[PDB]
């Protein structure tokens, strides 16, 4: 398969590009102050999977606020590590989700966020 640092989302493996782009473009035209986000565990992560992986988040929510919400859903221990990756790098927690989206969304108009217990995506 691919190299360990190539970001793979089961969402993309389960839904053809056409379906994703139709959905992402429609949701952005409808809700211009919200951004659509797919959240999944990185393949090698020793972290629980998320119940819900598809989010519509306010554009003025910060990355650190979204992280709080996602971490709350995973039900981690107080000592546990968790890192987000967008396009292979840890996104700045002080950025807004709207800015992160504007810079990083794919051609299907989704923003893709992976999480791991390791600070490097493929480790």
């Amino acid at each position: 398969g691919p190299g360990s640092e190539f970001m793979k989302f089961q969402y993309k493996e389960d839904h053809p590009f056409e379906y994703r782009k139709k959905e992402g473009e429609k949701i952005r035209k409808k809700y211009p102050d919200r951004v659509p986000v797919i959240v999944e565990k990185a393949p090698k992560a020793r972290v629980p999977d998320l119940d819900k992986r598809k989010y519509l988040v306010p554009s003025d929510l910060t990355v650190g606020q979204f992280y709080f919400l996602i971490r709350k859903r995973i039900h981690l221990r107080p000592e546990d590590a968790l890192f987000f990756f967008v396009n292979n790098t840890i996104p700045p927690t002080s950025a807004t989700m709207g800015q992160l989206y504007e810079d990083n969304h794919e051609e299907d108009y989704f923003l893709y966020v992976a999480y791991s217990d390791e600070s490097v995506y493929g480790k």
Binding site: H15, Y55, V57, Q65
Partner: peptide
């Protein structure tokens, strides 16, 4: 339940803004 959207509630957003406020 194929592929629903999840949106946070307003109170959930409020709690997040309080626990991860800007510096």
């Amino acid at each position: 339940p194929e592929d629903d959207w999840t949106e946070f509630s307003s109170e959930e957003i409020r709690e997040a803004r309080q626990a991860a406020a800007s510096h």
